Design an enzyme around this catalytic site. Structure first.
Site, PDB file in Angstrom:
ATOM      1  N   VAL A  26      -4.344 -60.459 -28.515  1.00 38.48           N
ATOM      2  CA  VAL A  26      -4.957 -61.412 -29.428  1.00 38.48           C
ATOM      3  C   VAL A  26      -3.813 -62.188 -30.055  1.00 38.48           C
ATOM      4  CG1 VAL A  26      -6.483 -61.708 -31.398  1.00 38.48           C
ATOM      5  CG2 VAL A  26      -6.675 -59.676 -29.955  1.00 38.48           C
ATOM      6  N   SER A  28       0.875 -61.862 -30.917  1.00 38.94           N
ATOM      7  CA  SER A  28       2.107 -61.099 -30.992  1.00 38.94           C
ATOM      8  C   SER A  28       3.049 -61.858 -31.921  1.00 38.94           C
ATOM      9  CB  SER A  28       2.721 -60.969 -29.593  1.00 38.94           C
ATOM     10  OG  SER A  28       3.868 -60.138 -29.604  1.00 38.94           O
ATOM     11  N   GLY A  29       4.088 -61.183 -32.397  1.00 39.31           N
ATOM     12  CA  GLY A  29       5.030 -61.836 -33.284  1.00 39.31           C
ATOM     13  C   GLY A  29       6.181 -60.931 -33.660  1.00 39.31           C
ATOM     14  N   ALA A  30       6.990 -61.374 -34.616  1.00 41.62           N
ATOM     15  CA  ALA A  30       8.132 -60.588 -35.067  1.00 41.62           C
ATOM     16  C   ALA A  30       7.639 -59.262 -35.623  1.00 41.62           C
ATOM     17  CB  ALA A  30       8.906 -61.350 -36.139  1.00 41.62           C
ATOM     18  N   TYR A  31       6.423 -59.278 -36.165  1.00 39.62           N
ATOM     19  CA  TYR A  31       5.788 -58.098 -36.753  1.00 39.62           C
ATOM     20  C   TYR A  31       5.432 -57.073 -35.680  1.00 39.62           C
ATOM     21  CZ  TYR A  31       1.529 -59.718 -34.607  1.00 39.62           C
ATOM     22  OH  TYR A  31       0.596 -60.105 -33.669  1.00 39.62           O
ATOM     23  N   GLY A  32       5.126 -57.573 -34.486  1.00 38.11           N
ATOM     24  CA  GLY A  32       4.742 -56.723 -33.374  1.00 38.11           C
ATOM     25  C   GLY A  32       3.675 -57.447 -32.577  1.00 38.11           C
ATOM     26  N   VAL A  34      -1.040 -57.658 -31.853  1.00 37.19           N
ATOM     27  CA  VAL A  34      -2.404 -57.205 -32.044  1.00 37.19           C
ATOM     28  C   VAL A  34      -3.173 -57.363 -30.746  1.00 37.19           C
ATOM     29  CG1 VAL A  34      -4.557 -57.627 -33.212  1.00 37.19           C
ATOM     30  CG2 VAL A  34      -2.406 -57.862 -34.426  1.00 37.19           C
ATOM     31  N   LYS A  49      -3.277 -53.022 -33.891  1.00 35.89           N
ATOM     32  CA  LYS A  49      -1.985 -53.634 -34.168  1.00 35.89           C
ATOM     33  C   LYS A  49      -0.824 -52.656 -34.107  1.00 35.89           C
ATOM     34  CE  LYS A  49      -0.978 -54.926 -38.377  1.00 35.89           C
ATOM     35  NZ  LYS A  49      -0.828 -55.842 -39.530  1.00 35.89           N
ATOM     36  N   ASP A 159      -4.394 -59.209 -44.883  1.00 32.97           N
ATOM     37  CA  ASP A 159      -3.064 -59.716 -45.151  1.00 32.97           C
ATOM     38  C   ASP A 159      -2.162 -59.589 -43.932  1.00 32.97           C
ATOM     39  OD1 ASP A 159      -0.480 -60.265 -46.036  1.00 32.97           O
ATOM     40  OD2 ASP A 159      -0.900 -59.497 -48.049  1.00 32.97           O
TER      41      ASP A 159
HETATM   42  C1  LIG Z   1       2.859 -62.111 -39.233  1.00 36.80           C
HETATM   43  S1  LIG Z   1       1.685 -62.791 -38.000  1.00 36.80           S
HETATM   44  O1  LIG Z   1       1.160 -64.259 -38.422  1.00 36.80           O
HETATM   45  C2  LIG Z   1       0.337 -61.660 -37.831  1.00 36.80           C
HETATM   46  C3  LIG Z   1      -0.916 -62.164 -37.271  1.00 36.80           C
HETATM   47  C4  LIG Z   1      -2.034 -61.259 -37.133  1.00 36.80           C
HETATM   48  C5  LIG Z   1      -1.938 -59.832 -37.544  1.00 36.80           C
HETATM   49  C6  LIG Z   1      -3.072 -58.958 -37.405  1.00 36.80           C
HETATM   50  N1  LIG Z   1      -3.043 -57.615 -37.772  1.00 36.80           N
HETATM   51  C7  LIG Z   1      -4.353 -57.172 -37.468  1.00 36.80           C
HETATM   52  C8  LIG Z   1      -4.753 -55.810 -37.704  1.00 36.80           C
HETATM   53  C9  LIG Z   1      -5.276 -54.895 -36.637  1.00 36.80           C
HETATM   54  C10 LIG Z   1      -5.655 -53.527 -36.964  1.00 36.80           C
HETATM   55  C11 LIG Z   1      -5.519 -53.054 -38.353  1.00 36.80           C
HETATM   56  F1  LIG Z   1      -5.859 -51.785 -38.709  1.00 36.80           F
HETATM   57  C12 LIG Z   1      -5.014 -53.934 -39.389  1.00 36.80           C
HETATM   58  C13 LIG Z   1      -4.637 -55.288 -39.072  1.00 36.80           C
HETATM   59  C14 LIG Z   1      -5.133 -58.334 -36.908  1.00 36.80           C
HETATM   60  C15 LIG Z   1      -6.523 -58.479 -36.431  1.00 36.80           C
HETATM   61  C16 LIG Z   1      -7.660 -57.906 -37.247  1.00 36.80           C
HETATM   62  C17 LIG Z   1      -9.015 -58.061 -36.767  1.00 36.80           C
HETATM   63  N2  LIG Z   1      -9.255 -58.732 -35.570  1.00 36.80           N
HETATM   64  C18 LIG Z   1      -8.263 -59.290 -34.760  1.00 36.80           C
HETATM   65  C19 LIG Z   1      -6.854 -59.188 -35.155  1.00 36.80           C
HETATM   66  N3  LIG Z   1      -4.272 -59.438 -36.888  1.00 36.80           N
HETATM   67  C20 LIG Z   1      -0.630 -59.365 -38.107  1.00 36.80           C
HETATM   68  C21 LIG Z   1       0.500 -60.264 -38.252  1.00 36.80           C
END
Ligand SMILES: C[S@](=O)c1ccc(-c2nc(-c3ccc(F)cc3)c(-c3ccncc3)[nH]2)cc1
Length: 330
Positions: A26, A28-32, A34, A49, A159
């Site tokens: 869905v 990806s990024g510096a954070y890792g 999803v 994620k 967030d």
């Molecule tokens: C820093 S970057 O812009 C960035 C973008 C997305 C996410 C990001 N983290 C999550 C995510 C997944 C599981 C969890 F338990 C908590 C957060 C999602 C997510 C949640 C629901 N449906 C689709 C995707 N997106 C983290 C960092």
């Protein structure tokens, strides 16, 4: 202890439990990254994620711990919830990767209005903010991209990794309270009502000028509260601008929405409407239910003032993973 399986996903490697299938990137990024997935146990579609370099440094380790602690605490319809948290590791020594799981959400407020829709969406944000704020947690960075929405028009705050939605007090860094989030809601609600960014500043200075044009320069009462000498000087050196009549700015919009906007977009944070007070505003008459706008259990943030070693944060994080209790099937 489940059985994991590996697979490379866009340069990113993943090692999740058997129950999760059809991992589809869905993002990806510096954070890792999803991945969208199918939870075979529950039958629901989930978002998984993988944090990247969770314990690369003390700050990372602490951020990892912070995120897990926050996620495990959130249990509200309008706030992202943790369906599962796992790691391939069999012990602390091997512990180096963290995967977080939550219900898959289709779009964000950016991706996506009638007045009834604005009412329902803002109502849900406020309902989620009341909960978060009751736990002494401040989002601090509310914006459309942080608001997930599904096909039912149901919304969830998340967030908690831009300045267009930031309250002025926290963009220069005097004192601020929970209402910095209310300001953000105001900017969001405005955008939904008009279809345009309310304060699209090019930088912090331009941003502030744009804001003052609408809300007017600080009055004498607010000025008396600015401890920052330089900020006080700057503001006072600017053009004395009058507060615009929001009705004249948001022409054609529900008068009640205008009223709420005026109560949310106030410069003096001490007078800004709170999430709970906003929920009782006539604008949400059709959705407001005092008996179904719950507060949160107390949240222990004392860890924020602690200076620990990378290994200690990693360990605290490990315990949080181990102690995780799955939510009742939905
Ligand atoms: C820093 S970057 O812009 C960035 C973008 C997305 C996410 C990001 N983290 C999550 C995510 C997944 C599981 C969890 F338990 C908590 C957060 C999602 C997510 C949640 C629901 N449906 C689709 C995707 N997106 C983290 C960092």
């Amino acid at each position: 202890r489940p059985t994991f399986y590996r697979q490379e996903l866009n340069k990113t490697i993943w090692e999740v439990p058997e129950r999760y299938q059809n991992l589809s990137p869905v993002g990806s990024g510096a954070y890792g990254s999803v991945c969208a997935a199918f939870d075979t146990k529950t039958g629901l579609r989930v978002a998984v994620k993988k944090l990247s370099r969770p314990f690369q440094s003390i700050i990372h380790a602490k951020r990892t711990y912070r995120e897990l602690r926050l996620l495990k605490h959130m249990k509200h319809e309008n706030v992202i919830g943790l369906l599962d948290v796992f790691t391939p590791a069999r012990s602390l020594e091997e512990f180096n990767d963290v995967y977080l799981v939550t219900h898959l959400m289709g779009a964000d407020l950016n991706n996506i209005l009638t007045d009834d829709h604005v009412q329902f969406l803002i109502y849900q944000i406020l309902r989620g903010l009341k909960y978060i704020h009751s736990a002494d947690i401040i989002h601090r960075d509310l914006k459309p991209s942080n608001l997930a929405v599904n096909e039912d028009c149901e919304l969830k705050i998340l967030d908690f990794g831009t300045r267009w939605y930031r309250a002025p007090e926290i963009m220069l860094n005097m004192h601020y309270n929970q209402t910095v989030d209310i300001w953000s809601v105001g900017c969001i609600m405005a955008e939904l009502l008009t279809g345009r960014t309310l304060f699209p500043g090019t930088d912090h200075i331009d941003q502030l000028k744009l804001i003052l044009r609408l809300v007017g320069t600080p009055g004498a009462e607010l000025l008396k509260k600015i401890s920052s000498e330089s900020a006080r000087n700057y503001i006072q050196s600017l053009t004395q601008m009058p507060k615009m009549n929001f009705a004249n700015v948001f022409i054609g919009a529900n008068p009640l929405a205008v009223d709420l906007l005026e109560k949310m977009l106030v410069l003096d944070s001490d007078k800004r409407i709170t999430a709970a007070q906003a929920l009782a505003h006539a604008y949400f008459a059709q959705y407001h239910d005092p008996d179904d706008e719950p507060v949160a259990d107390p949240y222990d943030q004392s860890f924020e003032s602690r200076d620990l070693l990378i290994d200690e944060w990693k360990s605290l994080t490990y315990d949080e993973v181990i102690s995780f209790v799955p939510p009742p099937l939905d």
